[PDB]
């Protein structure tokens, strides 16, 4: 307790750990150092897009619900554009409690029309499947995949088209994550259809959340060390209990060695999701001691650190491609006016979340967030984000696999499914598109067994905590920022010092939603026993 | 919002309102005034007992569980005997997380032996009665009393002896409070037997909680005005919406009039529970524009303020008598060593809560709290608290009704039921007893109908909030301090700006406890369906 803290990794997970060390660990920023491997900001290794190239969204999937971790954290961060003592939480709830998020054209098909998404579209064996899924033990679902467990007809329901699009989830990936979602969002499973439970910032997560958080940390005195890629930790293992001795990093191409005392504590983001990303664009194409080194060397030391080869093994399985579109007005945005909750330029929500083309062989989705998306972007430009799931198949209009098809060609498949395939040439020159083909963007979703991921504090560790989407808590990793903050809090709390599924009202909210808003099995009975009792309100009304 | 606040009443409710105005209303102490009707502290109208007379506990029943309101409040109050930044919450959990509270001789009878209190002692129709009680609508239980609804055999169960003793509750009082208890403590209904869920301060609630809270408020600048008994408020009622214009008080025997602007806000504790208390003792006896004036005048103005005559109407119904015993060592404390969790002088918990003599015609209970009870009391003295329910009946040994029997005589009924009736003379001179016979100590428990109590903010009011145990929220009033803080928070929040029963695990925790720890009706079925599922842990094991 006159110790220092070392934080390996620049991200929401790392910054949140520093915050929790300051507020609730009662240590000072001067004893905190963040080890980053970025150059300095943005130049040749561009920071986060330029307004004259065409912008390039980090990559990828940044969606938020109203969880308690966010409220507890960003309640103490000074706002982005407001004076003291207004927080970023107050900005978040000001711009969003006025204009709530909900979708009008969530599912589309037949090259321009909306597929009815009022209900989840489950029959009866499908409902039984998820209920049977909810009842299975976690010990009995090792390596079982989505398509293995689920029926063939289930993967064509509204439910699966919505779920796989929302989380960018492949049919060959972990069943445990779908189960974990059920156990945690039964109350809100109706929201998968209208996007009610989703809530967005004014700008990005970076510009609206992390940028106020970094400013706050600098105003607290935390140390930053760029150009530092950590590849291993040397640790002692006496009495079956381990402590970190040194950080073996390579700084600016030369080995360094950072000494760690017994009192100090170390936080490390383990895996990567943006490793071998090829950044092609409109006319050229993508092509194809790393960030996985730290975890791989840790895996050699003991089994309590898991098997990273199970997540970075097959890069064709954990890969999909995004594309950032910068549009000056064209028939693409004219069509977009027809599918929007408001107007794109209004400043309010527009598409209300992603829009997924269901009969697209690519499983192609696209979103127009609350415009403007970036602080420095002009009023005659809109930033749309597009991405797809299947990298193996020919498009419906462009008979090219999407990893081989680039830029302009992506506009044709998109405009075909939008109902403006005859007006491609006009939108093609007016919209700047930059692509990102990420080979580990879903490596956390890969099939796994018990022990494959280490806990936030593995058994024995006294000064090392791991963060991110590759660590075993008791929760899902499908929400990227939420999971980063949760692990950060567990890490800081454990080394120092320190529900919804069982709710009867939620099981009724779930069962009715699973049965497409129609009265479910025991409901007619539950009304007759409860309509004249204290518990009348737990049931929804019948037609 | 450069307004002032007026707080009618000195108590936990009033102080908490001032706290919530400061922390979360963001106003300053200089604009807060508390209107009290005490002389100045303690002298002739003794403050809270002297160590040479025999002490006199406020009166009465001060018990606490681990609710969130306490944590949220006393987290910011500097501790009583610890340095900064240690709070009173930290004192509370330090002295109690080491020595947890639980009882060894909770129920006693046959003049010295313990009545088995492992289980609630419900048969099967009794269990059905409480379940049927839980299912009734609150609109259908107006004025219904305990003995009216419940069977005769139910009132002899372990359950009713425990419940009536814990809350000092008469068989002719409101059924709604027993129902409200069920809806809120199903998870913890087992705790009625062992006193697990109860948690006590080091000293009193006054010396350990309120005394740090008042010091905190004075260090914030809040104004106090003793000798001020408020009897009415003059209010305008335009547009069906009312505002307080003036506080009509009598200060030191002369009418005053305090002007209230449109921006200001007023908090008033409505009723009294210690009004006509006669303070007899060892050898003499009790005898028999008031605190009810403010509510009575308010009741004239509108129906939205309720019917106070329904609570202060029959003072024989809302009355019982307490007695504070100060003992230098005698055979009473020697016997007490046999019934204690630890030793009385140890400094730890002793009796673990009240001890109730079930075959006592008075329904006589007594407690020895964590000694010492007061800060200024010596090591060779113990403060015991005793009280009884039935004022109409002859004792088992002293054939006197207890309102007529005093001091020494109270020692005989107590020592008889303790098994030391032959050693009364020794304890009689060594123990100083002071009695309190309160005529409204349970006026809040009196039968009531919808509309009898006003809400924290009655419909229409814009600057007046009411506090205490006579206001309609959605919760019980059987916990005195908890209810005072809850109403205080509702009052401050509403005028400015701003679960457990439905838990499946809790219904199983309740059903097993109702059925005396033996497997209940559907349990054998619930095991067969759930033992090999995700939900195995929600059930308790079978023998």
Short mmCIF file of C-alpha atoms in Angstrom, two decimals, chain A residues 33-346:
data_model
loop_
_atom_site.label_atom_id
_atom_site.label_comp_id
_atom_site.label_asym_id
_atom_site.label_seq_id
_atom_site.Cartn_x
_atom_site.Cartn_y
_atom_site.Cartn_z
CA UNK A 33 1.18 3.25 -15.91
CA UNK A 34 -0.57 2.09 -19.09
CA UNK A 35 1.63 0.11 -21.49
CA UNK A 36 0.38 0.71 -25.05
CA UNK A 37 1.80 -0.46 -28.37
CA UNK A 38 0.52 2.40 -30.53
CA UNK A 39 2.93 4.72 -32.31
CA UNK A 40 1.78 7.98 -30.78
CA UNK A 41 -1.70 8.88 -32.14
CA UNK A 42 -2.73 8.91 -35.80
CA UNK A 43 -0.71 9.69 -38.92
CA UNK A 44 0.47 6.90 -41.20
CA UNK A 45 -1.02 4.31 -38.85
CA UNK A 46 -4.18 6.39 -39.02
CA UNK A 47 -5.84 7.17 -35.72
CA UNK A 48 -9.50 6.53 -36.54
CA UNK A 49 -10.21 7.78 -40.06
CA UNK A 50 -9.82 11.06 -41.93
CA UNK A 51 -12.76 13.11 -43.26
CA UNK A 52 -11.24 13.35 -46.76
CA UNK A 53 -10.28 9.70 -47.25
CA UNK A 54 -13.59 8.16 -46.27
CA UNK A 55 -13.46 7.24 -42.57
CA UNK A 56 -12.81 3.75 -41.19
CA UNK A 57 -14.78 2.56 -38.17
CA UNK A 58 -12.51 0.76 -35.65
CA UNK A 59 -14.18 -2.61 -36.26
CA UNK A 60 -16.52 -3.64 -34.98
CA UNK A 61 -20.00 -3.96 -33.46
CA UNK A 62 -20.35 -1.34 -30.69
CA UNK A 63 -23.83 -1.65 -29.15
CA UNK A 64 -25.04 -0.87 -25.64
CA UNK A 65 -27.97 -1.59 -23.32
CA UNK A 66 -28.73 0.04 -19.95
CA UNK A 67 -26.56 -1.91 -17.54
CA UNK A 68 -25.43 -0.81 -14.08
CA UNK A 69 -21.67 -0.96 -14.76
CA UNK A 70 -21.92 1.97 -17.19
CA UNK A 71 -23.93 4.07 -14.72
CA UNK A 72 -21.56 3.32 -11.84
CA UNK A 73 -18.50 4.18 -13.95
CA UNK A 74 -19.33 7.18 -16.15
CA UNK A 75 -21.17 8.97 -13.33
CA UNK A 76 -17.80 10.45 -12.28
CA UNK A 77 -16.30 11.41 -15.67
CA UNK A 78 -16.60 15.09 -16.68
CA UNK A 79 -18.77 15.48 -19.77
CA UNK A 80 -17.48 15.86 -23.33
CA UNK A 81 -19.16 19.13 -24.37
CA UNK A 82 -20.92 20.29 -21.17
CA UNK A 83 -19.59 22.28 -18.19
CA UNK A 84 -19.00 21.07 -14.66
CA UNK A 85 -20.36 19.21 -12.86
CA UNK A 86 -22.15 17.56 -15.78
CA UNK A 87 -20.91 14.03 -16.42
CA UNK A 88 -20.73 11.92 -19.56
CA UNK A 89 -23.60 9.90 -18.07
CA UNK A 90 -25.66 13.10 -18.20
CA UNK A 91 -24.74 13.60 -21.86
CA UNK A 92 -25.59 9.95 -22.49
CA UNK A 93 -29.06 10.18 -20.96
CA UNK A 94 -29.78 13.67 -22.31
CA UNK A 95 -29.25 12.85 -25.99
CA UNK A 96 -30.96 9.45 -25.59
CA UNK A 97 -33.89 9.91 -23.19
CA UNK A 98 -35.24 12.49 -25.65
CA UNK A 99 -34.79 10.42 -28.84
CA UNK A 100 -35.19 6.73 -27.87
CA UNK A 101 -33.78 4.07 -30.17
CA UNK A 102 -36.09 1.72 -32.08
CA UNK A 103 -36.13 0.23 -35.56
CA UNK A 104 -38.49 0.49 -38.54
CA UNK A 105 -36.79 -1.72 -41.18
CA UNK A 106 -34.81 -4.16 -39.05
CA UNK A 107 -35.18 -7.12 -41.41
CA UNK A 108 -35.40 -6.72 -45.18
CA UNK A 109 -35.55 -9.03 -48.19
CA UNK A 110 -36.89 -9.33 -51.75
CA UNK A 111 -34.57 -6.47 -52.75
CA UNK A 112 -36.32 -3.61 -51.03
CA UNK A 113 -39.20 -4.68 -48.78
CA UNK A 114 -39.27 -5.26 -45.02
CA UNK A 115 -39.60 -8.75 -43.59
CA UNK A 116 -42.12 -8.74 -40.75
CA UNK A 117 -40.17 -8.67 -37.48
CA UNK A 118 -42.99 -8.06 -34.98
CA UNK A 119 -42.41 -11.52 -33.49
CA UNK A 120 -39.48 -13.89 -33.04
CA UNK A 121 -41.18 -16.35 -35.41
CA UNK A 122 -40.76 -19.48 -33.28
CA UNK A 123 -43.07 -22.43 -33.93
CA UNK A 124 -43.30 -24.71 -30.89
CA UNK A 125 -40.38 -27.10 -31.16
CA UNK A 126 -38.22 -23.98 -31.48
CA UNK A 127 -39.58 -22.58 -28.20
CA UNK A 128 -39.00 -25.99 -26.60
CA UNK A 129 -35.41 -25.96 -27.93
CA UNK A 130 -34.50 -22.71 -26.17
CA UNK A 131 -36.27 -23.82 -22.99
CA UNK A 132 -34.40 -27.13 -23.19
CA UNK A 133 -31.27 -25.04 -23.82
CA UNK A 134 -31.97 -22.97 -20.68
CA UNK A 135 -32.20 -26.18 -18.61
CA UNK A 136 -28.92 -27.79 -19.69
CA UNK A 137 -25.89 -27.71 -17.41
CA UNK A 138 -22.89 -25.66 -18.49
CA UNK A 139 -20.67 -28.68 -17.78
CA UNK A 140 -22.49 -30.65 -20.52
CA UNK A 141 -22.08 -28.20 -23.43
CA UNK A 142 -18.36 -28.35 -24.21
CA UNK A 143 -17.46 -27.43 -27.80
CA UNK A 144 -21.08 -27.83 -28.93
CA UNK A 145 -21.83 -25.35 -31.70
CA UNK A 146 -24.95 -23.48 -32.79
CA UNK A 147 -25.89 -25.62 -35.79
CA UNK A 148 -25.02 -28.84 -33.94
CA UNK A 149 -27.54 -28.22 -31.16
CA UNK A 150 -30.23 -26.33 -33.05
CA UNK A 151 -32.55 -27.65 -35.73
CA UNK A 152 -32.17 -26.63 -39.35
CA UNK A 153 -35.51 -24.80 -39.40
CA UNK A 154 -34.55 -22.89 -36.24
CA UNK A 155 -31.68 -21.13 -38.06
CA UNK A 156 -34.23 -19.58 -40.48
CA UNK A 157 -36.46 -18.08 -37.79
CA UNK A 158 -36.73 -14.33 -37.26
CA UNK A 159 -35.00 -15.04 -33.93
CA UNK A 160 -31.78 -16.36 -35.42
CA UNK A 161 -31.60 -13.72 -38.16
CA UNK A 162 -31.93 -11.07 -35.45
CA UNK A 163 -29.56 -12.69 -32.94
CA UNK A 164 -26.78 -13.52 -35.40
CA UNK A 165 -26.92 -10.04 -36.92
CA UNK A 166 -26.95 -8.20 -33.58
CA UNK A 167 -23.85 -9.94 -32.23
CA UNK A 168 -22.12 -10.92 -35.51
CA UNK A 169 -22.24 -14.59 -34.60
CA UNK A 170 -21.45 -17.54 -36.84
CA UNK A 171 -23.47 -20.76 -36.97
CA UNK A 172 -20.28 -22.72 -36.12
CA UNK A 173 -19.51 -20.83 -32.89
CA UNK A 174 -20.16 -21.35 -29.21
CA UNK A 175 -23.59 -22.42 -27.99
CA UNK A 176 -22.67 -21.26 -24.47
CA UNK A 177 -23.00 -17.61 -25.53
CA UNK A 178 -26.56 -18.05 -26.80
CA UNK A 179 -27.42 -19.84 -23.55
CA UNK A 180 -25.78 -17.11 -21.43
CA UNK A 181 -27.82 -14.53 -23.36
CA UNK A 182 -31.06 -16.37 -22.55
CA UNK A 183 -30.29 -16.60 -18.81
CA UNK A 184 -29.65 -12.84 -18.70
CA UNK A 185 -32.14 -11.18 -21.07
CA UNK A 186 -35.37 -13.17 -20.64
CA UNK A 187 -37.09 -9.99 -19.43
CA UNK A 188 -35.95 -8.16 -22.58
CA UNK A 189 -36.00 -10.86 -25.28
CA UNK A 190 -38.84 -8.92 -26.92
CA UNK A 191 -36.34 -6.10 -27.47
CA UNK A 192 -34.43 -8.16 -30.05
CA UNK A 193 -37.16 -7.14 -32.52
CA UNK A 194 -37.66 -3.40 -31.99
CA UNK A 195 -34.19 -2.50 -30.59
CA UNK A 196 -35.83 -0.91 -27.54
CA UNK A 197 -33.22 -2.02 -25.00
CA UNK A 198 -30.39 -0.58 -27.11
CA UNK A 199 -29.09 2.90 -26.25
CA UNK A 200 -26.40 4.81 -28.14
CA UNK A 201 -24.04 7.73 -27.44
CA UNK A 202 -24.04 10.99 -29.37
CA UNK A 203 -20.89 10.07 -31.33
CA UNK A 204 -18.84 6.88 -31.08
CA UNK A 205 -17.97 4.91 -28.00
CA UNK A 206 -14.47 6.34 -28.49
CA UNK A 207 -15.37 10.02 -28.90
CA UNK A 208 -18.26 10.03 -26.41
CA UNK A 209 -17.08 7.61 -23.69
CA UNK A 210 -13.36 6.82 -23.74
CA UNK A 211 -12.16 10.31 -24.73
CA UNK A 212 -13.76 11.82 -21.60
CA UNK A 213 -12.34 8.88 -19.60
CA UNK A 214 -8.76 9.40 -20.84
CA UNK A 215 -8.90 13.17 -20.23
CA UNK A 216 -10.13 12.34 -16.72
CA UNK A 217 -7.23 9.96 -16.13
CA UNK A 218 -4.65 12.47 -17.38
CA UNK A 219 -6.17 15.01 -15.01
CA UNK A 220 -5.44 12.39 -12.35
CA UNK A 221 -1.78 11.83 -13.28
CA UNK A 222 -1.68 8.32 -14.81
CA UNK A 223 1.43 7.41 -16.82
CA UNK A 224 1.35 6.25 -20.46
CA UNK A 225 4.11 4.32 -22.30
CA UNK A 226 3.44 3.97 -26.03
CA UNK A 227 5.37 1.68 -28.39
CA UNK A 228 5.48 -1.04 -25.72
CA UNK A 229 4.24 -4.48 -26.83
CA UNK A 230 4.39 -6.95 -23.92
CA UNK A 231 5.20 -10.53 -24.92
CA UNK A 232 5.71 -12.39 -21.62
CA UNK A 233 5.80 -12.22 -17.82
CA UNK A 234 8.38 -14.06 -15.72
CA UNK A 235 6.69 -15.47 -12.63
CA UNK A 236 7.58 -17.49 -9.56
CA UNK A 237 5.41 -20.47 -8.58
CA UNK A 238 6.09 -21.44 -4.95
CA UNK A 239 3.46 -23.14 -2.76
CA UNK A 240 1.13 -23.49 -5.73
CA UNK A 241 0.68 -19.70 -5.58
CA UNK A 242 2.21 -17.46 -8.25
CA UNK A 243 3.40 -13.83 -8.39
CA UNK A 244 4.53 -11.72 -11.37
CA UNK A 245 8.20 -10.70 -11.18
CA UNK A 246 8.89 -8.81 -14.42
CA UNK A 247 7.24 -7.50 -17.59
CA UNK A 248 9.22 -8.62 -20.65
CA UNK A 249 8.37 -6.01 -23.29
CA UNK A 250 9.85 -4.84 -26.58
CA UNK A 251 9.91 -1.03 -26.68
CA UNK A 252 10.66 0.58 -30.06
CA UNK A 253 12.22 -2.64 -31.32
CA UNK A 254 14.49 -3.32 -28.34
CA UNK A 255 14.05 -5.64 -25.38
CA UNK A 256 13.20 -4.03 -22.06
CA UNK A 257 12.59 -5.48 -18.62
CA UNK A 258 10.33 -3.82 -16.04
CA UNK A 259 10.72 -4.94 -12.44
CA UNK A 260 7.63 -5.64 -10.34
CA UNK A 261 7.71 -5.68 -6.56
CA UNK A 262 5.67 -7.96 -4.33
CA UNK A 263 3.21 -5.18 -3.49
CA UNK A 264 2.54 -4.16 -7.11
CA UNK A 265 -0.31 -5.42 -9.32
CA UNK A 266 -0.51 -6.10 -13.06
CA UNK A 267 -3.48 -5.98 -15.47
CA UNK A 268 -3.18 -7.49 -18.96
CA UNK A 269 -5.59 -7.63 -21.89
CA UNK A 270 -4.83 -11.09 -23.27
CA UNK A 271 -6.10 -11.58 -26.82
CA UNK A 272 -6.53 -9.58 -30.01
CA UNK A 273 -9.50 -9.13 -32.34
CA UNK A 274 -7.96 -6.78 -34.97
CA UNK A 275 -4.62 -8.53 -35.59
CA UNK A 276 -4.22 -9.32 -39.30
CA UNK A 277 -6.73 -6.80 -40.65
CA UNK A 278 -6.26 -5.85 -44.31
CA UNK A 279 -7.50 -2.32 -45.05
CA UNK A 280 -8.55 -2.36 -48.72
CA UNK A 281 -11.10 -0.01 -50.22
CA UNK A 282 -13.01 1.11 -53.30
CA UNK A 283 -10.72 -0.15 -56.08
CA UNK A 284 -7.78 -2.20 -54.73
CA UNK A 285 -8.69 -5.06 -52.20
CA UNK A 286 -7.58 -6.76 -48.96
CA UNK A 287 -4.84 -9.34 -49.04
CA UNK A 288 -3.69 -10.87 -45.70
CA UNK A 289 5.77 -11.82 -31.24
CA UNK A 290 2.16 -10.74 -31.77
CA UNK A 291 -0.67 -9.61 -29.50
CA UNK A 292 -1.34 -13.30 -28.78
CA UNK A 293 2.27 -13.79 -27.59
CA UNK A 294 1.56 -12.72 -24.00
CA UNK A 295 -1.26 -15.26 -23.61
CA UNK A 296 0.60 -18.02 -25.49
CA UNK A 297 3.64 -17.76 -23.20
CA UNK A 298 1.28 -17.68 -20.21
CA UNK A 299 -0.40 -20.85 -21.49
CA UNK A 300 2.96 -22.65 -21.41
CA UNK A 301 3.41 -21.84 -17.72
CA UNK A 302 0.23 -23.52 -16.49
CA UNK A 303 -3.16 -24.94 -17.42
CA UNK A 304 -4.88 -22.29 -15.29
CA UNK A 305 -4.27 -19.90 -18.21
CA UNK A 306 -6.18 -21.97 -20.76
CA UNK A 307 -5.76 -22.83 -24.43
CA UNK A 308 -5.48 -19.78 -26.73
CA UNK A 309 -4.94 -22.03 -29.78
CA UNK A 310 -8.65 -22.88 -29.50
CA UNK A 311 -9.54 -19.25 -30.32
CA UNK A 312 -6.78 -18.19 -32.76
CA UNK A 313 -6.49 -21.59 -34.45
CA UNK A 314 -8.68 -21.25 -37.56
CA UNK A 315 -8.76 -17.64 -38.83
CA UNK A 316 -11.35 -18.41 -41.52
CA UNK A 317 -13.78 -19.33 -38.72
CA UNK A 318 -13.27 -16.12 -36.70
CA UNK A 319 -13.33 -13.62 -39.55
CA UNK A 320 -15.75 -11.24 -41.20
CA UNK A 321 -15.33 -7.99 -43.08
CA UNK A 322 -16.69 -4.53 -42.35
CA UNK A 323 -16.78 -1.41 -44.52
CA UNK A 324 -17.16 2.27 -43.63
CA UNK A 325 -19.18 4.29 -46.15
CA UNK A 326 -18.91 8.09 -46.44
CA UNK A 327 -21.69 9.40 -48.67
CA UNK A 328 -22.40 12.74 -50.19
CA UNK A 329 -26.11 12.86 -51.09
CA UNK A 330 -27.12 10.30 -53.72
CA UNK A 331 -30.00 7.87 -54.44
CA UNK A 332 -28.55 5.68 -51.66
CA UNK A 333 -29.40 8.28 -49.02
CA UNK A 334 -32.63 9.09 -50.86
CA UNK A 335 -33.67 5.45 -50.48
CA UNK A 336 -32.41 5.65 -46.89
CA UNK A 337 -34.98 8.37 -46.18
CA UNK A 338 -37.69 5.73 -46.75
CA UNK A 339 -36.33 3.27 -44.15
CA UNK A 340 -35.48 5.71 -41.34
CA UNK A 341 -37.18 6.49 -38.04
CA UNK A 342 -36.39 10.17 -38.64
CA UNK A 343 -34.38 11.96 -41.22
CA UNK A 344 -30.69 10.99 -41.58
CA UNK A 345 -29.54 14.61 -41.24
CA UNK A 346 -32.00 15.38 -38.41
#
